Amino acid sequence: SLKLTALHFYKYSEPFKSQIVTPKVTLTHRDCLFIELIDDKGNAYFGECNAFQTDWYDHETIASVKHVIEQWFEDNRNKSFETYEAALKLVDSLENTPAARATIVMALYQMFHVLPSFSVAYGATASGLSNKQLESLKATKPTRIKLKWTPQIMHQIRVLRELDFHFQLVIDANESLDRQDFTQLQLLAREQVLYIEEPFKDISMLDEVADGTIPPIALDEKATSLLDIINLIELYNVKVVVLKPFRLGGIDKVQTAIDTLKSHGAKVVIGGMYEYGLSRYFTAMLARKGDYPGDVTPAGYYFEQDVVAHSGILKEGRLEFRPPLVDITQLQPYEGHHHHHH
């Protein structure tokens, strides 16, 4: 039997090695909320929140999640629970704030499971094809390469297909294409593209091209909730869904979502978004549940310094994960007298 005795909030904020520049946001740093729940034996368990500092991606922010979790703890502190399933009942009421819910569930999961060490497939991402990028691909031999749609797409695929190893090709089109791209999309179908993520901002454009003449279509940005994913699958010819556990409300919601989406004829890929090494571990752990290898980002891809080191080290085409142990000295109190600045 366990009871929760204390809650602490912390912040981490490392720079992105390369500034993030997208139509939705510019990010210089990944601001991130961490929670620590301490049980009645004095055992501390950490959770990593996937909300951002402002609402550029989603309505839940670091600040909104902090207030939600703080109230949740007031409502649930010192309550006894016997099992993982009893613990999850306590976060039933957080359905409407899935980012907050996922943060708590990440901590609760650790109270009831012995965490394995394991590997997942390495998939590379390329936004273009500089010498630095090409040399990395050649050296690391990924089994999947995700290439960003640009005007150079076909000219770059031709370089990639001369690389001395076979890989699955995914294209990320970033909700950026229009009717003038249909011809190219149809040509792209002859290049063994496993799927294309989000060709169109307006999903109804899929109805304008002959079905089966473009690559299989994935939801990423539009994979916002299980219910809206289902609504889109029932209306349009979507075959692949990129599932981010935090968007579903946490670790515990992933398998049910997968079972349901497979019953509607979709395939699932587990993915993440700008994670530190704590969340990255749980995303990787869940990746084998998907129909295709997960979109797991390697250790060090975004951040020079991490709160959990060695979380997804690339070795011989696979990413290696260890039970994640937060380095407490990297965290800072979120607020109050012990939140300092320099």
CATH number of the domain residue 224 falls in: 3.20.20.120
Contact 40, 77 (CB under 8 A): no
| Element containing residue 125 per DSSP (H, E) | strand 123-126
**3-class secondary structure, 236:** coil
Looking at residue 74, which CATH number applies to its domain?
Answer: 3.30.390.10
Residue 215 shares a structural domain with residue 141: yes
Q: Which residues are annotated as a binding site for Mg(2+)?
A: 172, 197, 220
**Residue in 119, 108, 116, 120 with CA at minimum distance from that of residue 323:** 116
In a domain? residue 339: no
DSSP 304: S
Active-site residue, selected from the candidate residues 146, 148, 222, 253: 148
Q: Which residues pair with 196 in a beta bridge?
A: 171, 217
Our answer to whether residue 17 is catalytic in this structure is: no
Residue 177 shares a structural domain with residue 299: yes
Method: X-ray
| Element containing residue 84 per DSSP (H, E) | helix 84-89
Rounded distance between C-alpha atoms, residue 209 and residue 182, angstroms: 7
Residue 168 shares a structural domain with residue 252: yes
Rounded distance between C-alpha atoms, residue 267 and residue 150, angstroms: 26
Residue 258 shares a structural domain with residue 211: yes
In a domain? residue 342: no
Residue 7 shares a structural domain with residue 96: yes
Residue 218 shares a structural domain with residue 264: yes
Range of the domain at 159: 117-322
Q: Which residues are annotated as a binding site?
A: 172, 197, 220
In a domain? residue 316: yes
How many separate domains does the chain show?
2
Residue 111 shares a structural domain with residue 19: yes
Instruction: DSSP for 242-297, please give it.
Output: EE-HHHHTSGGGHHHHHHHHHHTT-EEEEB-SS--HHHHHHHHHHGGGSSS--B-P
Q: What is the resolution of this structure in A?
A: 1.3
**Residue partners of 3: CB distance under 8 A and separation at least 6:** 39, 40, 77, 78, 79, 80, 81
Residue 63 shares a structural domain with residue 176: no
- The count of residues in the chain is 342
Instruction: DSSP for 163-197, please give it.
Output: SSS--EEEEE-TT---GGGHHHHHHHGGGTEEEEE
| Backbone phi and psi for residue 100, each to the nearest 5 degrees, phi listed first | -65, -45
In a domain? residue 278: yes
| Element containing residue 10 per DSSP (H, E) | strand 4-21
**Residue in 183, 126, 123, 121 with CA at minimum distance from that of residue 159:** 126
In a domain? residue 340: no
Residue 128 shares a structural domain with residue 108: no
Residue 186 shares a structural domain with residue 146: yes
Residue 230 shares a structural domain with residue 308: yes
Rounded distance between C-alpha atoms, residue 147 and residue 153, angstroms: 8
In a domain? residue 341: no
Our answer to whether residue 244 is catalytic in this structure is: yes
Active-site residue, selected from the candidate residues 66, 146, 222, 244: 244
Q: Tell me the angle at which helices 62-76 and 98-110 cross, rounded to the nearest 10 degrees.
A: 60
For residue 5, CA distances in Å to 54, 87, 112 come to 30, 14, 17
Contact 242, 273 (CB under 8 A): no
Question: Which value, in Å, is the radius of gyration of the alpha carbons in the chain?
Answer: 21
CB neighbours of residue 186 within 10 Å = 14
Residue 93 shares a structural domain with residue 143: no
